[PDB]
Amino acid sequence: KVYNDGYDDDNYDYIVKNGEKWMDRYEIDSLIGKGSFGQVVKAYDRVEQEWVAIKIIKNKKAFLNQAQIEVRLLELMNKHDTEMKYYIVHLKRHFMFRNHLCLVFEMLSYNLYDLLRNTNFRGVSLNLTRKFAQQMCTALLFLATPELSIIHCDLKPENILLCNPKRSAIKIVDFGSSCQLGQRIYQYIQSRFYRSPEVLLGMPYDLAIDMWSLGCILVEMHTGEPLFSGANEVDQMNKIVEVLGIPPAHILDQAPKARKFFEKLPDGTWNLKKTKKREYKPPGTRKLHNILGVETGGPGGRRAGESGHTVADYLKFKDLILRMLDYDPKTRIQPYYALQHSFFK
Numbered sequence: 001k002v003y004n005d006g007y008d009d010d011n012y013d014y015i016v017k018n019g020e021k022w023m024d025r026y027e028i029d030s031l032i033g034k035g036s037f038g039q040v041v042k043a044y045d046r047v048e049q050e051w052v053a054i055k056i057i058k059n060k061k062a063f064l065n066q067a068q069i070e071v072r073l074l075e076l077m078n079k080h081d082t083e084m085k086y087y088i089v090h091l092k093r094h095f096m097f098r099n100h101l102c103l104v105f106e107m108l109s110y111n112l113y114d115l116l117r118n119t120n121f122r123g124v125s126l127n128l129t130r131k132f133a134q135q136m137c138t139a140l141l142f143l144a145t146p147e148l149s150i151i152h153c154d155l156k157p158e159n160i161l162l163c164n165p166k167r168s169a170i171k172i173v174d175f176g177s178s179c180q181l182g183q184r185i186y187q188y189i190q191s192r193f194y195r196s197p198e199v200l201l202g203m204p205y206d207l208a209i210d211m212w213s214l215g216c217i218l219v220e221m222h223t224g225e226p227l228f229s230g231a232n233e234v235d236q237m238n239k240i241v242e243v244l245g246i247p248p249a250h251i252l253d254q255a256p257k258a259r260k261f262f263e264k265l266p267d268g269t270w271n272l273k274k275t276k277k278r279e280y281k282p283p284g285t286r287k288l289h290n291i292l293g294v295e296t297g298g299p300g301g302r303r304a305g306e307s308g309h310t311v312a313d314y315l316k317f318k319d320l321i322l323r324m325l326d327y328d329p330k331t332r333i334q335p336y337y338a339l340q341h342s343f344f345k
């Protein structure tokens with residue numbers, strides 16, 4: 001009849017009540033969002049006298065254990081005293097409350113998907129995109145710190161928050177799906193739209209898969225729409241192929257799940273497999289040049305005449321993206337050099 005002395009529901013979630021005051025410190029205001037992990041609530045820390053976001057993990061061992069991994073990584077990042085640290089959301093502290101693990105983060109406005117929807121999915125400017133791109137690259141540079149070597153493993157608009165409604169700063173959230181560099185354990189990783197080719201092909205992966213995600217995200221930022229919106233993995237790959245063409249032979253020859261998408265011809269070359277529903281342009285004929293509208297006033301021609309949106313500006317943006325969307329994770333551009341690109345001058 002009751003769960004956790006009546007504090008929980010049948011989904012092991014803590015029943016959030018507005019006005020409730022935790023530990024004579026946190027004044028619960030309202031629910032921010034839900035997730036598999038549990039809930040995130042907006043609360044006022046009367047001690048520090050500031051708003052905070054509390055991530056209330058579900059009262060069950062499986063989610064508790066996963067959250068402790070997140071606490072480990074977040075605390076690990078906190079110990080490294082650099083200024084790049086400030087593009088990761090700050091874990092202030094954590095505590096147990098009524099059998100729930102609670103993580104206290106800084107309070108941020110809204111996520112990057114919310115910003116897109118506010119544009120009615122028409123995107124934001126190349127100028128705002130540049131600011132976001134530089135911070136993300138810096139964030140990825142921080143995660144590439146040898147002692148950290150952290151793969152976020154789930155970069156997407158939803159997991160990128162705006163620091164202030166009137167400022168251009170962003171921060172990355174949700175390191176619950178994250179782990180450090182190591183031997184391959186998991187294979188079905190990342191959100192589909194932003195899933196790297198090496199993951200789709202069932203190959204070994206590293207920190208480069210986050211760079212791939214970033215490339216997808218940045219395009220989506222300026223256009224307002226996902227670059228590769230696959231309804232499944234096969235559709236996802238075919239959308240990727242539409243833009244970038246057939247992946248190199250030296251990659252496909254070593255790909256365990258290559259024949260889920262491709263066909264090895266008698267001459268040793270690879271072609272797409274004939275699927276089913278749906279219809280795709282020939283490989284590489286959906287150019288990023290035309291998606292971005294480099295010479296046609298940007299996405300939908302809505303940036304024509306706008307400053308910071310010349311052909312030269314768009315060419316710099318396109319070039320950086322294509323370096324981020326390299327099929328080869330070993331030659332794919334890295335954070336340190338992404339930041340040195342001409343797009344960021």
Ligand SMILES: O=c1ccc2cnc3ccc(-c4cn[nH]c4)cc3c2n1-c1ccc(F)cc1C(F)(F)F
Nearest residue numbers: 032033034040053105108109110111158159173174
């Ligand atoms: O969607 C938003 C909108 C605003 C917002 C504000 N603060 C947040 C603080 C922390 C987190 C978070 C930390 N771990 N996982 C999520 C998430 C925060 C947050 N989120 C967010 C982002 C990712 C996510 F998986 C869940 C949320 C949630 F809405 F708060 F639940």
